[PDB]
Amino acid sequence: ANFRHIVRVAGVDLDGNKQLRWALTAIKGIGINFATMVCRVAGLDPFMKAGYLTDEQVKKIEEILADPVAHGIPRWAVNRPKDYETGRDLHLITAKLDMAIREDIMRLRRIRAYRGIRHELGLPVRGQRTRSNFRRGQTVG
Template sequence: MSSEFRYIVRVAGVDLPGDKALAYALADIKGVGVNTAYAVLRKLGFDPHRLLGTLTEEEVEKISNALKNVEALGLPDWMLNRRRDPITGASSHLITSDLLLTVRGDIEAMKKIKSYKGIRHMLGLKVRGQRTRTTGRTGLTVGVRKGASKKQQEKK
């Protein structure tokens, strides 16, 4: 145990609160969810409910390296967030800016080949089959206008 509690801990290039449980603090990293954090911590032999601020520098480094290379831990492919990459065909797990850049690149590729999803992205419409009749509207709020009631029409 570290003799000193740290309120901010840097893991995998992200500042995390030291007063959170380890699994939930790691879930604040983009690309790492609570279930992935639990799986990684169990593989490494850490208690997921331990506070992040109580870890030593070596333990933080061990967790950081494991998150950067999740595939090496032997987790099943369905736990990884990039299964069967379209270019390489390999499964991997991306975090932080790597994840953002890869997703942006995928969207640009869909736009370039003019796939259905790419066209929807270009037009700023819903991509995954959601309804668009009433939701996803932008601009001025336009509601349904009721016609004049019968009494008002008789007065005229």
């Protein structure tokens, strides 16, 4: 069949010499596990080389990524198991993912939570000890 060296799926150029599993991981918001789940849902061989994918298979991948829950992927494998506003189970990739993370951080800062303060100051947010580690600056004195 026709072998494409570079294949673009969802705005990201996928490699041609790599298996579909690790090729799909080049998209932000998709790891190896989610890529394997998407391939199994689509019925594609996870071990096939990316590049042999046809247009119909690409569109199937696009629609699966658009609606993962409705396509058989479990509700506990999505990026946002419960959206703050809609309350639905959504999976976001790339620009949507960065926008959602930024919106959550901005909401914390707006409500003036402790996590928001820590995010603003750049200090660790998950209750770590800062006396001996997390040293980003240079030596003083």
